[PDB]
């Protein structure tokens with residue numbers, strides 16, 4: 001019997017709803033696919049070149065896989081942007097700040113949600129219809145061989161927190177509404193929204209994970225891991241671009257990466 005708690009539950013429900021609406025492949029579906037539940041179908045597994053050419057029925061392989069990742073990332077940016085607009089207060093912010101928050105927030109969100117599609121052995125692709133093994137991704141030619149490893153390392157750790165979609169919905173909102181982003185014009189309105197989101201997240205985790213002591217704090221500490229993945233990725237990208245002068249980068253990703261840090 002607390003009305004402030006009641007408003008925070010209302011916010012949590014709203015965010016979960018928009019999340020399900022914005023992201024076509026949820027963690028719940030991903031885990032059904034990965035663990036072999038009967039609600040969803042088995043993926044075709046790509047573990048080598050033959051299986052890759054087989055899978056394509058249902059050029060340069062490293063470059064093909066890399067650009068696949070890129071294209072998937074641009075559609076993820078599109079999904080995250082539609083989600084962000086559902087976050088109460090976001091579209092009422094200064095437009096330049098909306099842009100800044102998306103610019104710095106989207107990649108940290110991509111890697112958070114990518115974890116949902118991963119286990120220690122590989123990653124779901126093509127909306128869960130495929131599974132590409134971690135060893136196969138590791139085996140790719142020099143510059144490409146290690147692009148995915150840091151993401152797998154983060155994911156195994158992150159997934160040990162056993163978050164569900166209802167938790168992740170609030171956490172990603174919290175990520176987007178970060179007042180510490182470089183070049184923000186009006187920090188106060190953003191921190192006010194984030195404070196509300198943090199209250200909602202704390203209550204969600206206490207209610208959804210009553211036996212998981214300090215899960216809120218542990219989750220927030222993962223923001224440090226996300227930030228480091230993004231930094232590493234950015235530097236790997238600059239190596240790739242200099243060594244592979246014939247590989248195209250999508251303009252949207254290019255604009256996001258422009259003087260990030």
Ligand SMILES: CCc1ccc(CCOc2ccc(C[C@H]3SC(=O)NC3=O)cc2)nc1
Nearest residue numbers: 065068069070072073110123125126132253
């Ligand atoms: C169908 C082919 C295919 C094969 C591997 C993956 C794994 C996806 O892993 C990802 C890795 C990084 C990113 C985002 C990164 S990669 C890039 O070029 N730009 C980004 O922002 C997004 C996804 N997806 C699709």
